[PDB]
């Protein structure tokens, strides 16, 4: 076998062994030894992956593909590296004994295709339009990762957020990855009153005591019929000679902005949008105006905030002439909490910037929520196209391996051996779960595979919370279709991108 290929295989196995037992709900712990002082305890594999960057093989490719999978999906995506490492370990068993670096690629492509086919088979249907079911399934799946008490609280709010998030694209019917689903670290208070916020935080309005309150209609006005560009650098470009003169020449353009903002006052919109900046001196003069000026907003802001508002592009406050997207912002709320009064604007059935009403004396609960709603995002995205989801949790692995080997038994050619090898290598996730739970890895694996050989047992598996071969159906824990299929996609893709390497520099 090609020596450099075996080195890539060995590196893949090294990283696979780094986090192989770091998988599942009963994951083992890992220690990071920082030479300059301190130490970290972590069983969240992606944290290790981000920290353990001393690797300098072509496993850079594996690390970057894992980060891509983490930023796109994130939840439970550590298993891709375990799968890749096991598949490459079993690839080496053929690549080294007799050289054949390309037919193994064809075998892995066939394996990926048949895995997709069988995952679309063994899966159990779920509805996306009745609370009484997806509430239970997503509550269980979210509870699997890190939650003990706040499951019933955070699940409802995150799932309702994604339900609101549903229908954004109105074309491919695909919701954001993250362009809308932001979050704000609302501090302190009674943590149990963290409730739904079917809208988004509007940060920089109420910093002064008197900014703006409770305007219903999302009016805005631009430099169209009652406003003008002559607010800007209206006399001369800024020159730098001394701090006092620099501040005076800054307040020159700032005061002309003040002048057209005082003309904005009589226009009385709900909000206004600017990209260069606004003057607080003019903002103090906004009681009769009741307007808020939001400034230095990026194109992402002027996109999502404006279309979250569906802002009325008016010229005068007594008329309605144009809206960004209808009456998108149904309501706007300011809760009288915090030094910066938290302004929440409410939108309906629209693609919009996202933020949830959260309360916590500690930020662990206030940072779990977004990685919960990301899982909810994957669940809604796959169920809206495929009403379908997979047992997962190492249970479906045996069914997929059995189906793959059954197909292989009728397959000719030399590609047969690596394809059945992929079938066997898929068993690592249930194997690593059983090894993690301390049960007999080989005995339990044999029992589970034999039971999966029996008819209509495709949902049978192992419970990672107890370490036993009990069925994963009717136990309540499942994995999303899209997450599972994309895990196989990324695993086989990184396997092929690592085997396709046969020299460095």
């Amino acid at each position: 076998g090609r020596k450099v290929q075996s080195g890539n295989i060995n590196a893949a196995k090294t990283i696979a062994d780094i986090i192989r037992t770091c998988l599942g709900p009963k994951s083992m712990m890992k220690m990071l030894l920082d030479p300059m002082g301190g130490i970290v305890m972590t069983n969240d594999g992606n944290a290790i992956l981000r920290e353990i960057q001393v690797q300098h093989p072509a496993a850079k490719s594996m690390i970057e593909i894992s980060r891509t999978q983490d930023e796109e999906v994130g939840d439970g995506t550590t298993s891709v590296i375990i799968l890749a490492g096991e598949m490459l370990s079993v690839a080496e068993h053929f690549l080294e004994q007799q050289m054949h670096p390309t037919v193994v690629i064809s075998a892995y492509r066939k394996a990926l295709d048949d895995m997709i086919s069988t995952l679309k088979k063994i899966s159990i249907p779920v509805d996306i339009s009745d609370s009484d079911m997806m509430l239970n399934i997503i509550n269980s799946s979210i509870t699997t990762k890190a939650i003990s008490r706040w499951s019933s609280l955070a699940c409802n709010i995150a799932l309702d957020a994604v339900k609101m998030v549903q229908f954004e694209e109105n074309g491919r019917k695909e919701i954001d990855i993250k362009k809308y689903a932001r979050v704000e670290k609302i501090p302190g208070g009674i943590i149990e009153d963290s409730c739904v916020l079917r809208g988004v935080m509007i940060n920089k309005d109420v910093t002064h005591p008197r900014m703006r309150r409770y305007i219903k209609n999302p009016r805005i006005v631009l430099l169209d019929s009652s406003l003008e560009y002559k607010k800007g650098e209206s006399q001369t470009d800024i020159e730098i000679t001394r701090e006092e003169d620099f501040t005076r020449i800054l307040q020159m353009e700032e005061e002309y902005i003040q002048q057209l903002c005082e003309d904005i006052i009589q226009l009385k919109p709900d909000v206004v949008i600017t990209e260069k900046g606004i003057s607080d001196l003019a903002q103090h003069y906004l009681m009769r105006a009741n307007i808020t000026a939001i400034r230095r907003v990026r194109k992402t802001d002027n996109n999502r905030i404006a279309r979250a508002c569906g802002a009325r592009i008016v010229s005068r406050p007594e008329e309605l002439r144009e809206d960004d997207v209808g009456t998108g912002a149904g309501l706007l709320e300011i809760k009288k909490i915090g030094d910066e009064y938290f302004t929440f604007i409410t939108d309906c059935k629209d693609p919009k910037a996202c933020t949830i009403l959260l309360r916590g004396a500690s930020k662990e609960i206030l940072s779990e929520v977004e990685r919960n709603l990301q899982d909810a995002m994957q669940v809604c995205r796959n169920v809206l196209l495929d009403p379908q989801l997979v047992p997962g949790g190492g249970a479906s692995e045996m069914a997929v391996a059995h189906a793959l080997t059954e197909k292989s038994k009728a397959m000719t050619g030399v590609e047969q051996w690596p394809y059945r090898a992929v079938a066997q290598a898929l068993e690592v996730i249930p194997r690593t779960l059983i090894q993690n739970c301390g049960a007999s890895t080989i005995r339990l694996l044999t029992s589970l595979r034999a039971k999966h050989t029996q008819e209509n047992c495709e949902t049978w598996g192992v419970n990672g919370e107890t370490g036993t071969l009990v069925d994963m159906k009717e136990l309540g824990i499942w994995e999303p279709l899209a997450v599972k299929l994309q895990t196989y996609k990324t695993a086989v893709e990184t396997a092929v991108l690592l085997l396709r390497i046969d020299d460095i520099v």
Partner: protein, 514 residues
Amino acid sequence: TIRSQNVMAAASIANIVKSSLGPVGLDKMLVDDIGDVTITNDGATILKLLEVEHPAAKVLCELADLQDKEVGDGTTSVVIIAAELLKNADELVKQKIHPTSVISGYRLACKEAVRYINENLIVNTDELGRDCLINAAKTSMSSKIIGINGDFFANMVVDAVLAIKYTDIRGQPRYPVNSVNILKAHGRSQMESMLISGYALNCVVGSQGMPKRIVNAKIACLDFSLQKTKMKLGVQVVITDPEKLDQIRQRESDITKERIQKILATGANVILTTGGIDDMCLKYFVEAGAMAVRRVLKRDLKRIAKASGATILSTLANLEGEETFEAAMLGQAEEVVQERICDDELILIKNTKARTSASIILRGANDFMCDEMERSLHDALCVVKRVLESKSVVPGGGAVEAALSIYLENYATSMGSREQLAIAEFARSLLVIPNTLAVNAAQDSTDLVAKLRAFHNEAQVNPERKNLKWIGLDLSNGKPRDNKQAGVFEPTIVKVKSLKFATEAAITILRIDD
């Protein structure tokens, strides 16, 4: 011995690229900068981005990239062939054959190769008249990913590209890739993809108060623009007069309405909105009244103007227009019809007179296999462009290399001089492309190259099997295929020129002795 060290360095740089030869070639790791690692199997990219500190590798790669930039793709073959002949010439030098002898031998072998390839194994731009078959084979092998549907791609490509005709020196029948517009789409049965013999796009619906919906005897080539969101600022912020930059904006909107009235009066039903339209204007003018389009592809806009014999720059100074347009933009499409075609609201334009271009809409099912389809069509169109624009084609794969090897071995056996081994060993070394392709095809090279040698010997020793001269291999196969039912091909000009540059690189790197 320093020339032998040059030989070792060239062999190393050739082994770096060997595995990347062919479409089934393996990808390569190469690190020009610590910050990132590059994953590519393209020969040109890997040779350009990689560097080797040894001077001989510098010279070899510099000749390789000269070949790459001056005659196109083929630099990987140049490196492999040149360094293999280099190592084999070193083997001759160990046999006490002086370097100048193998220099003369390589020069004579290159001359005989140029004569032989152009004379005996060549096609006269007609594909022997089997264009509707080689393309059918070619589409199969240019697109493995597609599989079953097959022949329909060929039957469209043949005429969709023969419908093209460029204008250039003496008017060569080169038909560029951009001559066809690839319209990615999906949602229907994976059985068809309507080619537009002409061009296609989409426009506003309901606001079609113009006869583009039906048969148009005459058309336009006009641009378009409507705005109310501050598109045109004729006066700047130079003064602070509070109410003095809003009336010019609205009045520019009004005079643009005057412009479009001056345009809609002449009609001609081809009106295409240019870029810069803000989304606020897009949602305004669907209600405020616009004969607009949703800012269709500007590349498609340019290719449409070329496909109508009239570009807006010939009458207007810009793409918006304030002066009145001359009648130069009066288009001449024979037929323009709007149809609920492929279950989408496209406009369909037939083969517009004067200079013209083609297009296709995809009757796909779902997003990702249709992306695969959009990729396979690009591959097929580009490679058939290679084949025909070459205006002369040599049988691709290892066919030409094995035939040249056997013929040059016979020539060496019938030449008789100090460089007699040079011709024959050049021939033996030149099998490296069949060897490398067989290795990369997961096949045993000692058997595939063997079959190539046997077939070419039987073809050129007994004239009864002239057609046996056209068998080669490029891709994983159980038996080498003939290039008359199959259609893997390479341009004869680029192949012979790459061979000449490989020989010249070998000569230059063997002329350096101490």
